[PDB]
Amino acid sequence: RRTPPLGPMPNSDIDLSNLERLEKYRSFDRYRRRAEQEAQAPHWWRTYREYFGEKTDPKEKIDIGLPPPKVSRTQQLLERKQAIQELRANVEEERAARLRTASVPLDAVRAEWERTCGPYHKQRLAEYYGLYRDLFHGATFVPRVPLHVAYAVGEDDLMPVYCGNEVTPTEAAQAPEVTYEAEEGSLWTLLLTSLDGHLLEPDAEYLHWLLTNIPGNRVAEGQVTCPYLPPFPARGSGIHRLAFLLFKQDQPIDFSEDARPSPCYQLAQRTFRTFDFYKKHQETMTPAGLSFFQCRWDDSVTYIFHQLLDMREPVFEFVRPPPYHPKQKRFPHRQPLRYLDRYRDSHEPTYGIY
Amino acid sequence: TKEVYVPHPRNTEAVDLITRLPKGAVLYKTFVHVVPAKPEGTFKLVAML
């Protein structure tokens, strides 16, 4: 018995009459390139992607961010080609490339990258970390306003916050220095949330910091809707995510409902959900910038729990599932003598009635 | 499942085969998988120190 294929079978379009005249791969790399392309295409048979691939929703992710900037491609391309001609014309450039002594300036590369491809790379990385999935229930935005968060450590050093770089709770004891590029007369809202910190509820977050109606980029002059709380990742609970979300306010907004008492040391009051907060303020507010870091427990967290939060410190432990053994049988034929140990509760000699 | 089969570059016999294939032709082979049922573990509150 046979069943006809449910679709086009692999290696069907190949003409087998002219096999000798057909071009061959001849290289492993050319086959691999084609093989990788074939693996990514949708198929009507069972595939590994079907069972292991993350089940993305068919509808595209709603964009909730700022409009893309308008650029003149013709003028941009003309200027770019002119620059390469000038660089290539220099004889010293050619010799350095030929002798493999040339190098690129990393500082300049990052500055240009931040202006151009930075936002899309930050969006890609934010998606990988799950920020969009958790903060906005899958809605994504392009962080078109670069946000520079740095924790002052000591008097001469800074700890920059990028996009998942690790910052310890000790370094984040005090509020960070936040600087972004903003025009005059604009308004902004900056918040800090711990996606993974919440102890009682899995889906909830902790609002560590909230600044509202910030005039321009003068963060110090914004209203302290919620005071700053240093991160308190619990011992043994893993690595948490803390995200800075900058928002561009179309108009002045009232955050009386979101106002938290100063100081706020009640975890119930700190409980916060970004989706709910943004949804009510969506009409007058748009996500602009994004930063985040990764924080694990350190000894300073004990200070937060005992003193600031006036609670006992919760310790957690990663517990693995118990080992599986088949049902014990009265006669374990051909099994070693250690079979009996597998089903023994205690290791100390028992004497029964005696 | 049925998956695209790419041999190891060190496998002389299989590598010879694919380089002689006509361009656009991809080999396929049957693979057997195990979809993990349980997670590696769970964090559990052990103390309140």
């Binding site: 294929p5 290696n11 | 049957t30």
Partner: peptide, 21 residues
Amino acid sequence: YKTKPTHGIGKYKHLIKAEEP
């Protein structure tokens, strides 16, 4: 498997010229 529509998805010797010593 023979009965299944994916029968023969792994066929590859028809794509290579036969080798004769």
